[PDB]
């Protein structure tokens, strides 16, 4: 009830920083303008359910209008066998409903940056009708492949080792009828809980972009779609790079309940450019419209153009993974860590994250020239509960 926020922008960032700092928040006026569907969105209320499920002692209170919530956070326990599940290796089930338009990386990015600060492991299993493992048009969410091999190496940079991260899909799905729907189930297993993340330093220039590797996925369409997409993306990137290599993945169709239906018919592509210097990777994704039927070569050219855009633009980390690396840099020890952002990278979401950290109680950021070096002072919180044996 104490701290006060307004608006529906950066909602998951506000709740996750509230959980990590232990500061009780109160977010008012979610949808004041919308007369048709005011209040909380279904993906937002399902993220509230997931946050209650993985935490312990957190009290979430949604109002009668649905336009104001308050949130007194508790500790991030994870899957302990006395409170959350029955066994320590058991996956906590989470179902998200059929009226869900955002991708599953909308749930995975806050959970993956809230997961190294837990007590036990995290073994979340996202099932249900509305679990889209693809990119959305939506708010342009990342795919599962983009999310995995673009942002989990950043935890590898921080010292949360990716030897113990297990993000695996069991079915894959796109949106289907309109934006709503899904069907493809995932499970994420964080077994690498750290006390304090390392204060990293991204300062040297990530000049030579050495190679491009990627994933083109097709669920419900012909398997020549990814071959045509690979020929389009190679026709764009062969002017620049000799080694572009894009895996092809194909799944038949996922079935949801109504008597089951096959939903999530679509196809998309996800390129990742690896710089020879360090853990610096630029990613881009593009998905078919869930009703449109556009050319796969158009999609391959579109994702290659977005990848060359991000390679032109980015200093060290792209703006999709910049809030995650900046909030982990803030969670680290009481030293300064230095990120090298591009001047084009700075975004209203990044700026809103800065405003939220200043409101919560972290120190401000120091911006100097080198693209600009942003330097963040850690707050030294870490994780609160861990059994020091």
């Amino acid at each position: 009830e104490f701290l006060r926020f307004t608006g529906h922008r950066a909602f998951t960032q506000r709740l996750v920083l509230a959980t990590l700092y232990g500061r009780p928040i109160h977010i008012s006026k979610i949808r004041s303008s919308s007369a048709t569907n005011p209040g909380l969105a279904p993906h937002e209320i399902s993220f509230l359910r997931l946050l209650e499920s993985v935490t312990n002692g957190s009290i979430i209170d949604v109002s009668y209008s649905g336009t104001t919530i308050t949130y007194q956070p508790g500790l991030i326990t994870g899957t302990v066998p006395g409170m959350n599940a029955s066994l320590s290796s058991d996956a906590i089930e989470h179902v998200i409903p059929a009226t869900n338009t955002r991708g599953i990386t909308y749930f995975l990015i806050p959970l993956a940056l809230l997961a190294p600060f837990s007590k036990a492991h995290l073994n979340v299993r996202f099932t249900g009708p509305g679990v889209i493992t693809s990119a959305t048009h939506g708010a342009r969410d990342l795919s599962i492949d983009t999310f995995r091999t673009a942002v989990l190496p950043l935890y590898g940079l921080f010292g949360i080792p990716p030897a113990r991260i297990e993000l695996r899909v069991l079915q894959r799905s796109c949106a289907g009828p309109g934006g709503k729907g899904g069907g493809g189930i995932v499970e994420m297993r964080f077994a690498s809980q750290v006390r304090l993340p390392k204060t990293l330093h991204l300062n040297r220039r990530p000049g030579k972009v050495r190679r491009i590797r990627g994933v083109a996925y097709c669920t419900g369409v012909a398997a020549s779609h990814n071959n045509r997409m690979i020929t389009a993306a190679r026709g764009v990137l062969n002017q620049l790079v000799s080694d572009v290599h894009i895996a092809a993945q194909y799944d038949p169709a996922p079935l949801v309940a109504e008597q089951k239906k096959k939903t999530g018919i679509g196809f998309g592509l996800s390129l990742v450019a690896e710089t020879s210097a360090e853990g610096v990777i630029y990613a881009a994704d593009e998905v078919a419209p869930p009703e449109g039927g556009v050319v796969p070569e158009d999609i391959g050219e579109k994702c290659a153009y977005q990848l060359l855009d991000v390679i032109a633009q980015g200093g060290c980390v792209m703006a999709a993974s910049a809030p995650t690396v900046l909030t982990l840099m803030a969670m680290g020890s009481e030293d300064v860590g230095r990120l090298r952002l591009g001047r084009r990278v700075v975004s209203p979401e990044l700026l809103e994250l800065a405003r939220d950290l200043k409101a919560f109680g972290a120190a401000s950021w120091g911006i100097r020239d080198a693209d600009l070096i942003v330097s963040v002072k850690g707050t030294g919180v870490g994780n609160v509960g861990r059994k020091v044996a």
Binding site: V221, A222, S224, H225, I265, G266, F267, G293, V295, P296
Partner: protein
């Protein structure tokens, strides 16, 4: 060799049907390969696509017809329906009567099927 080709009722996309047991669906304005349909064991004898261009039926010599969706070209259901090599297929063009996604198929076993 092109065995059978048909247009779209809204003149947007073309569809040829080869001897290589495959179907190539092209765009009408510039002749760029929109997609290709596979999975026929024997060469395609005929095809007919729907009035709103959301369906293709494709009649082959391997004694079945295929229904494709024409966005992403996913086979809706391969349905084995004749005892011999199905010569021709045809949609009814008007959905004024509420039945525009129905189609006839005529085969070498002396049968038409609605």
């Amino acid at each position: 060799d092109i065995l059978s080709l048909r247009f779209s009722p809204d003149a947007r996309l073309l569809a040829v049907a080869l001897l290589d047991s495959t179907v190539k669906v092209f765009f009408n304005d510039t002749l760029k390969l929109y997609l290709n349909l596979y999975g026929h064991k024997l060469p395609v004898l005929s095809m007919d696509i729907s009035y709103d261009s959301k369906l293709i039926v494709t009649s082959s010599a391997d004694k079945n017809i295929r229904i494709w969706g024409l966005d992403f070209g996913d086979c809706h259901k391969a349905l084995f329906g004749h005892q011999d090599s199905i010569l021709q297929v045809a949609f009814i063009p008007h959905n004024s009567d509420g039945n525009g996604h129905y189609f006839f198929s005529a085969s070498k076993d002396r049968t038409i099927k609605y």
